[PDB]
Design a protein around this ligand. Structure first.
Ligand code: HEM
Ligand code: HEM
Ligand SMILES: Cc1cc(N)nc2cc(-c3ccc(OCc4ccc(C#N)cc4)c(CN)c3)ccc12
Ligand SMILES: Cc1cc(N)nc2cc(-c3ccc(OCc4ccc(C#N)cc4)c(CN)c3)ccc12
Ligand SMILES: C[C@H](O)[C@H](O)[C@H]1CNc2nc(N)[nH]c(=O)c2N1
Ligand SMILES: C[C@H](O)[C@H](O)[C@H]1CNc2nc(N)[nH]c(=O)c2N1
Ligand SMILES: [Zn+2]
Lengths: 414, 409
């Protein structure tokens, strides 16, 4: 690979120079002859010999970041890590290194448009947790802290790392807060279609479903490789926003609402070769995640048609753009409702503008900023946002957030 | 290896084998994806490229390894020997132009690829001849509003000192002028080309929608200016089905999109002048041409007449005015019976096209970054369709702007 790679912004003419790609760690899935940039997921534990260089790489990075590279504390930390891998096949991160690694997994997340915030992350160390009840306690505290009565604060809670792969900690939920989905005998779906499979697991595990349109799912929590256990989030911890429109008084009659806190909980955090299989993290929403995807995806709540009816649009011709018109109004209502209730939210114009400033800053201070254009560009109004015209380079740095298989597909039931 | 692509809305899975035939590079490596980067012969290089192309031609007409196939290869080898190049047969030229379109990973319109009128202009020698061929193309492709896809292919590159080039980036485009106070009148995308035309002797009317002259270069000579006969230039006034003030904005656009600055590669031969045209997808005009900050940039004016609150981004005033502008464009072309396709219909056709190509061809190279429309992305079916991008030949390629290379004789 060449030392310098340039990217151009075709709207402003600004050219930026990337050297950080030289530190890329993993395969992207692409080759010289095929690009897999639109593949959702392109791309048993580590041996002693695999772990040694991965830890040294991270430790070196850490001591370089605190401007102590080659120092006595650096060499002593290396040697202590090396002995621990020798005599235990693993090692333990210091609290400082845990915090640094979690912030940089966020900093490195190429699909995240919100990374201008990466250094303001509250890290909850939950590595002393031993049971699913204790996981529940840690998650409730996380939810309450991050919600902050609507003044949301980004946070991650980190449970014990993988050991032999048979004692994994896992949150079986895909997000800490999501709405149940129920397939009906007639083929229709009540609630959120995206969550039908997980809802069925919960019901089989013992959950009694209220069977409504917006039922908060219980937590299904797995500690130390044991069978997962069910817990109800205290509903006073779940901040929700009813959706209304500043002009259309009838919009509230749709009975729509959504929850304030997006808290993805099924990803794996990799730091220094260590694998944190339970690491729920939360920020705040960009409006289009709710208004475009959650509400208007055909396989989600799919409300475009009903909203267009109440708007009395012609729905016979696609070229009337009735779908685009209703989509805008739905997203206006979502932003209006969160702002009115003083729940943190960012519109897609503000967020993408901030991301561009962030990316420019990262290129100049760090030598680059891996970014996945396919994910960064918002799902509506793409070209009237600045990221659309911004060339990006995508590559994988560590520490990193990784996908992992769903736990019900791999779990060995006791 | 067989690669799978999934549609996450319908759960359909397709299996790609066609990527195994590509030879040109994408720009990506195993460690870095350049998917969003806009732009990532001799006797010895030429014969394998020619042989590959002749081989796929005769395989396409189900005569692979035939007597005609065998003799064509020897004819081509003998010719590259004695002239350092070769000439395509007419059948080969047509097959290669259609497949350059079929292989254009960035084009959502490719369900039409085999409906392409190919105009062979390889006998052309002067810019006057180029202008004649191009007028015929514009007249044929416009067809009084019932647009017909077409390409006109001028003589191929020889030594690189005798290139045929259309200096225009499209056959029909509007001029752009730098203003004294600092702003831009007309289309800012064409400011530089407009100045070259003025410097070359074009008298500019200095309006907002002045159709540019043709600047045409034959056999490496200085380019020459020509005016397209105005009766050949079909235009649409833009009005809105509900907002009667919209027509008062004075907006119009041309009906015929005809890209003229790309290079067509067939069997190792380079056709540096090959203008090709189809018909518009509404968002090309209504989103990019009208609403790019560095194009006509009209969102402010429209939202002002819509009386929207423009004080905060989260009112989505830009998004509202964007939809209304794209309604007007589609409504205007349709009312005037000028062919146009909306982005919902176009992307639906492309998903169908992908299914066809995977069935009959083993795949379809497709550039998600370009295929997904510039508005309303995820409510179109391509947003949820995984695509594999790879480079097949014959192909359309980018080439340098002629004024950056031309030694003015
Ligand atoms: C603070 C405000 C934040 C905003 C506005 C934000 C915004 C976004 C958005 C819009 C996406 C695309 C999600 C989708 O389409 O489903 C995303 C993805 C992502 N975000 Fe951020 N995010 C924020 C905080 C965070 C935090 C705190 C973390 C981790 C520490 C994080 C890590 C990620 C990751 C890993 C992805 C990719 C997820 C995947 O591939 O499934 N984000 N973010
Ligand atoms: C017939 C109707 C057609 C439609 C609706 C259509 C649609 C489109 C659209 C929307 C784009 C994106 C262009 C941009 O954003 O600037 C595009 C690109 C492209 N089209 Fe098609 N197209 C059509 C016909 C054709 C024909 C006839 C050819 C060639 C014979 C062709 C070759 C290409 C190529 C090479 C590109 C990529 C341009 C680039 O890389 O800059 N298209 N098309
Ligand atoms: C920290 C934070 C803040 C914020 N504001 N937003 C976030 C959004 C995500 C995020 C990414 C992909 C997802 O998933 C994509 C997907 C789509 C379809 C299928 C299917 N079938 C499977 C996955 C989902 C959904 N939980 C969330 C993650 C973290 C966020
Ligand atoms: C056959 C056909 C039909 C149709 N319906 N549509 C088309 C649209 C294009 C097309 C692609 C890229 C472009 O170029 C984008 C660009 C952006 C920034 C810079 C810069 N700086 C330079 C070029 C331009 C512009 N003529 C047109 C090509 C063929 C089309
Ligand atoms: C097929 C395609 O890669 C897939 O639909 C992606 C596209 N880009 C996305 N971008 C974001 N932010 N979130 C998504 O879920 C997706 N889905
Ligand atoms: C930087 C980015 O690649 C560039 O803006 C691309 C993005 N996608 C596009 N898609 C289409 N159809 N046309 C374009 O000009 C672009 N521009
Ligand atoms: Zn790639």
């Amino acid at each position: 690979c060449p030392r310098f790679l340039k990217v151009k912004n075709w709207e402003t003419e600004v050219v930026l120079t990337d050297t950080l790609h030289l530190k890329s760690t993993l395969e992207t899935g692409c080759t010289e002859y095929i690009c897999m940039g639109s593949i959702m997921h392109p791309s048993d534990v580590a041996t002693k010999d695999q772990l040694f260089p991965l830890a040294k790489e991270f430790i070196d990075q850490y001591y370089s970041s605190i401007k102590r590279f080659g120092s006595k504390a650096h060499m002593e930390r290396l040697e202590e890590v090396n002995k621990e891998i020798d005599t235990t096949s693993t090692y333990q991160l210091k609290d400082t290194e845990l915090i640094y690694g979690a912030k940089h997994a966020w900093r490195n997340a190429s699909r995240c448009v919100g990374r201008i915030q990466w250094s303001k992350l509250q890290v909850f160390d939950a590595r002393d947790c031993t049971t699913a009840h204790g996981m529940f306690n840690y998650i409730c505290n996380h939810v309450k802290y991050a919600t902050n009565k609507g003044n949301l604060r980004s946070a991650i809670t980190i449970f014990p790392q993988r050991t032999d792969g048979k004692h994994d900690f896992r949150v079986w939920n895909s997000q800490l807060i999501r709405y149940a989905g129920y397939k009906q005998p007639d083929g229709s779906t009540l609630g959120d279609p995206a969550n039908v499979q997980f809802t069925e697991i919960c019901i089989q595990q013992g959950w009694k479903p209220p069977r409504g349109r917006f039922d908060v799912l219980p937590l299904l929590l797995q500690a130390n490789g044991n069978d997962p256990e069910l817990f109800q989030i205290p509903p006073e911890l779940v901040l929700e926003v009813p959706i209304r429109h500043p002009k259309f008084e009838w919009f509230k009659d749709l009975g729509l609402k959504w929850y304030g806190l997006p808290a993805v909980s099924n990803m794996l955090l990799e730091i220094g070769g260590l694998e944190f299989s339970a690491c729920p993290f939360s920020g705040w929403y960009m409006g289009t995640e709710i208004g475009v995807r959650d509400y208007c995806d055909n396989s989600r709540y799919n409300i475009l048609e009903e909203v267009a009816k109440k708007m009395n649009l012609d729905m016979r011709k696609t070229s009337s753009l009735w779908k685009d018109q209703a989509l805008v109004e739905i997203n206006i209502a979502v932003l209006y409702s969160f702002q009115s209730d003083k729940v943190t939210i960012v519109d897609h114009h503000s967020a993408t503008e901030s991301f561009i400033k962030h990316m420019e800053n990262e290129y100049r201070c760090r030598g680059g900023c891996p970014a996945d254009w396919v994910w960064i560009v918002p799902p509506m109004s793409g070209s009237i946002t600045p990221v659309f015209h911004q060339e990006m380079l995508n590559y994988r740095l560590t520490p990193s957030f990784e996908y992992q298989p769903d736990p019900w597909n791999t779990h060995v039931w006791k």
